[PDB]
Amino acid sequence: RHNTAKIAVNIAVREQIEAGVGAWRLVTDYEDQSPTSNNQVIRREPIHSAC
Amino acid sequence: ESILSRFDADWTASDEARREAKNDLFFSRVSQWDDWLSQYTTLQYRGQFDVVRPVVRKLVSEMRQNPIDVLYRPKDGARPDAADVLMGMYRTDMRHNTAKIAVNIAVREQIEAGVGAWRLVTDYEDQSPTSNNQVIRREPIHSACSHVIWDSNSKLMDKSDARHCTVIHSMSQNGWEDFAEKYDLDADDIPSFQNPNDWVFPWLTQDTIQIAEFYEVVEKKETAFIYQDPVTGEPVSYFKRDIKDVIDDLADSGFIKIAERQIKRRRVYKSIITCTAVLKDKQLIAGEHIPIVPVFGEWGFVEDKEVYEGVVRLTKDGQRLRNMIMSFNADIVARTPKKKPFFWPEQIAGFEHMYDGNDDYPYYLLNRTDENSGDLPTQPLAYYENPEVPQANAYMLEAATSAVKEVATLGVDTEAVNGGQVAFDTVNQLNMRADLETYVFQDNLATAMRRDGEIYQSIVNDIYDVPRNVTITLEDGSEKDVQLMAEVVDLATGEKQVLNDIRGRYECYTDVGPSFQSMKQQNRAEILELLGKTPQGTPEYQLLLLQYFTLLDGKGVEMMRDYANKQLIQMGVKKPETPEEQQWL
């Protein structure tokens, strides 16, 4: 459903050279985006400018 | 009103305008027009200098592999012959399209002219045939660089929800086009909009025309179905539930349920949040959301004010004083007061005809006499002597000429291994799904494939049950012809206009990858290198001949799919989709 992470992997690996590492964003807990049997995976993503 | 929320923060745009936003035009100011910055004590004439195309120009010619023609990912939800409701819908490529260039405008839009906003088909079709089979068009917008500011989502967008910043489309004195279906009388709504064109007021061209009223703002929704507290009267009956771990069967603890969630919304109306007002109502539309989405490149930002994604101008070092040559020569070819050969011209310039080029050149009265002096070597050497005779530009001309040792060295390779995919391409493929993503994840009301709903014809099941005498059919040739005449049926009937998010009606998901267009393209990988694919032997007799057709589904040869009927039946493989007909024998 999501084959590749477009910019998320790109700036994350470059930022750690540029600045100190940050956090990694995710949907908190459950039952908001597309709840159902099967159907549940949330793709990787860094946090917002907390680095 | 009492709360300034959406407006007050929107007064901040012009607060940084005097610093970042008025000079944020750099993209088009370095790419075109005038970069004038620090100048003082100057004269006018200057200002066509184009060295910036070499860096910007190859990126639009960079990659021809962006179009990525790809076909038909299947899945396990519905088998490929269960897709029968569409057929040739998007098999058409796209409609007859002005937008085949539009995506090519979008791929350079990471900055270019400040990122534009994307536009799709405000309302339904004017042309109304049957057998819908609907393809479509797209356009972005121009300008709108720093004039629009986006704090919304900006990170992971599948746009499963319709939250948008501002959607209404036009700018012009005919821009009142946008509402042509709507109210549309005198255009009297009188807003005040966004005029940051730096003005000392020498000259002209300010127009106030803009149509902006917010559309859909901050949707917030909670469901967590089928759990509640039925008794005691319930002040603000609805409440919030998240964690589900340890619950088990409570059914006998009390009331039965058999309940569904009717959408419960009274949204306190700030009414489209127009600083002035909106004069019309009833924006509630159909099933799911509005198909329009944004178009987006790579994202990065730091703090309050920034400058983003340097590509165009890396040479800003030498761009400044390499034009001091204008002051070297063009200044001194002007200012010169009479380069002079002073030998014995103490009186110098005589009567007119001397400098008119009269007759022949020899001159008159070069004379010398001196009163009490004494004579020693007076030596008039000075012709104004020497220009700056630049030396270091046998050196420094190359540094302003070449910073590309640091720049153009990016992606050194020719072809074959070590491909040329760069960060520009890798993020843009998620735009192409707009040809499809817009039509699918939305639920929408009736396409009315056959006789609208016609939910069940099952009534016909009433006529056949025959207890008294029944016999099996005696040997059957002749009239039966095509089968399916009603005898006994269990149809697995249910399909509804809005089937909400449920699987089995879904179409296709993201196929993105390299340029492979799938009918067996990567099993034989051609490119420029490998050769031997499927050599001769027993396996190829059943492999390359029947299975490999570069002609796709083409009907120019009907013996493509005709192998199976009278020849291979003893082996038992067929490979049509088996729509219609059979054998005689």
* Nearest to B392, CA basis, from B315, B334, B321: B321
Q: How many beta-carbon pairs below 8 A join chains A and B?
A: 40
Beta strand ranges found along B126-272 (DSSP E) = 139-140
Q: Which residues of A touch B (CB under 8 A)?
A: 1-4, 6-7, 10-11, 25, 29-31, 33-34, 36, 43, 45, 48-49
Backbone torsions φ then ψ of B29, nearest 5 degrees: -80, -30
Cβ pair B243:A29 closer than 8 A: yes
Q: Which of A3, A33, A48 is closest, CB to CB, to B510?
A: A3
Is residue B380 packed enough to be buried (19+ CB in 10 Å), middle (13-18) or exposed (0-12)? Answer: exposed
| DSSP secondary structure, B202-267, as one string | SS---------------------TT----SS--TT--------SS----GGGS-------------
Residues with Cβ within 8 Å of residue B226, at least 6 apart in sequence: B257, B259, B261
Q: Which of B155, B295, B433, B516 to mutate to test the interface with A (most CBs of A within 10 A)?
A: B155
Say if CB B296 and CB B157 are below 8 A apart: yes
Cβ pair B512:A3 closer than 8 A: yes
Q: Which two three-digit tokens encode residue B11? A: 């007064």
Q: Which residues of A touch B512 (CB under 8 A)?
A: 3-4
Residues with Cβ within 8 Å of residue B66, at least 6 apart in sequence: B103, B104, B107, B425, B428, B429
Q: Which residues of B touch A18 (CB under 8 A)?
A: none
Residues with Cβ within 8 Å of residue B103, at least 6 apart in sequence: B66, B138, B431, B432
- CA–CA dist B549, B358 (Å, integer): 90
Q: Which residues of B touch A45 (CB under 8 A)?
A: 155-156
Q: Which residues of B touch A34 (CB under 8 A)?
A: 160, 501
Nearest chain A Cα distance for residue B308, angstroms:
14
Say if CB B493 and CB B421 are below 8 A apart: no
- Residue B270 to residues B3, B150, B289, B386, B467: CA-CA distances in angstroms? 11, 20, 20, 76, 70
Nearest chain B Cα distance for residue A17, angstroms:
15
Cβ pair A29:B509 closer than 8 A: no
- CA–CA dist B290, B188 (Å, integer): 28
The backbone region for B125, taken as left when phi is positive above 0, alpha when psi lies in -120 to 50, beta otherwise, is beta
- CA–CA dist B125, B128 (Å, integer): 7
Identify the H or E element spanning B119.
strand B118-119
CA B24 to chain centroid, in Å, comes to 21
In single-letter form, the type of residue at position B466 comes to: V
Residues with Cβ within 8 Å of residue B496, at least 6 apart in sequence: B453, B455
Cβ pair B155:A34 closer than 8 A: no
What is the three-class DSSP state of B271?
helix
CA angle A12, A18, A23 (to 5 degrees): 40
| DSSP state for residue B513 in the 8-state scheme | S
- Residue B422 to residues B108, B297, B374, B427: CA-CA distances in angstroms? 13, 13, 83, 9
Q: Which two three-digit tokens encode residue B423? A: 């960060």
Nearest chain B Cα distance for residue A20, angstroms:
13
Q: Which two three-digit tokens encode residue B184? A: 């549309």
Cβ pair A3:B426 closer than 8 A: no
Nearest chain A Cα distance for residue B256, angstroms:
23
Q: Which of B160, B244, B430 is closest, CB to CB, to A6?
A: B430
- CA–CA dist A27, A43 (Å, integer): 10
Say if CB B157 and CB A45 are below 8 A apart: no
Say if CB A3 and CB B514 are below 8 A apart: no
Q: Which two three-digit tokens encode residue B557? A: 């040869």
* Nearest to B231, CA basis, from B255, B265, B263, B264: B255
Cβ pair B510:A43 closer than 8 A: no
- CA–CA dist B244, B242 (Å, integer): 7
Cβ pair B509:A10 closer than 8 A: no
Q: Which of B242, B430, B513 is closest, CB to CB, to A31?
A: B242
Say if CB B291 and CB B121 are below 8 A apart: yes
Identify the H or E element spanning B29.
helix B26-31
Nearest chain B Cα distance for residue A7, angstroms:
6
**What is the SS3 assignment for B424-444?**
HHHHHHHHHCHHHHHHHCCCC
- CA–CA dist B319, B54 (Å, integer): 14
Backbone torsions φ then ψ of B82, nearest 5 degrees: -90, 5
* Nearest to B140, CA basis, from B96, B179, B180, B103: B103
Say if CB B169 and CB B143 are below 8 A apart: no
Backbone torsions φ then ψ of B139, nearest 5 degrees: -145, 140
Say if CB B293 and CB B157 are below 8 A apart: yes
Cα-only R_g, chain B: 39
Residues with Cβ within 8 Å of residue A11, at least 6 apart in sequence: A46, B298, B300
Q: Which residues of B touch A11 (CB under 8 A)?
A: 298, 300
Q: Which two three-digit tokens encode residue B384? A: 């104004």
Say if CB B429 and CB B296 are below 8 A apart: no
* Nearest to B561, CA basis, from B571, B547, B543, B572: B547
Q: Which residues of A touch B153 (CB under 8 A)?
A: none
> What are the start-end ranges of the H helices in B77-219?
102-107
Q: Which of A3, A7, A34 is closest, CB to CB, to B299?
A: A7
Q: Which residues of B touch A (CB under 8 A)?
A: 155-156, 160, 224, 242-244, 298-302, 423, 426-427, 430, 501, 509-510, 512-513
C-beta atoms surrounding B415 within 10 Å: 10
Four-point Cα dihedral B428, B430, B434, B437, nearest 10: 180
Cβ pair A4:B512 closer than 8 A: yes
Cβ pair B501:A36 closer than 8 A: yes
Residues with Cβ within 8 Å of residue B192, at least 6 apart in sequence: B208
| DSSP state for residue B348 in the 8-state scheme | -
> What are the start-end ranges of the H helices in B423-563?
423-432, 434-440, 538-541, 544-547
Q: What is the largest CA-CA distance in chain B?
A: 161
Q: Which two three-digit tokens encode residue B349? A: 């310039």
Residues with Cβ within 8 Å of residue B339, at least 6 apart in sequence: B383, B384
Residues with Cβ within 8 Å of residue B282, at least 6 apart in sequence: none
- CA–CA dist B52, B168 (Å, integer): 35
Report the residue count for chain A.
51
Say if CB B103 and CB B429 are below 8 A apart: no
Kindly identify which residue of chain B lies nearest to residue A25, measuring between CA atoms. Answer: B155
* Beta bridge pairs of residue B118: B140
Q: What was the elucidation method?
A: X-ray
* Nearest to B424, CA basis, from A44, A47, A14, A10: A10
> What are the start-end ranges of the H helices in B32-122?
53-60, 102-107
Cβ pair B426:A34 closer than 8 A: no
Pairing of strands B118-119, B139-140: antiparallel
Nearest chain A Cα distance for residue B435, angstroms:
16
* Beta bridge pairs of residue B139: B119
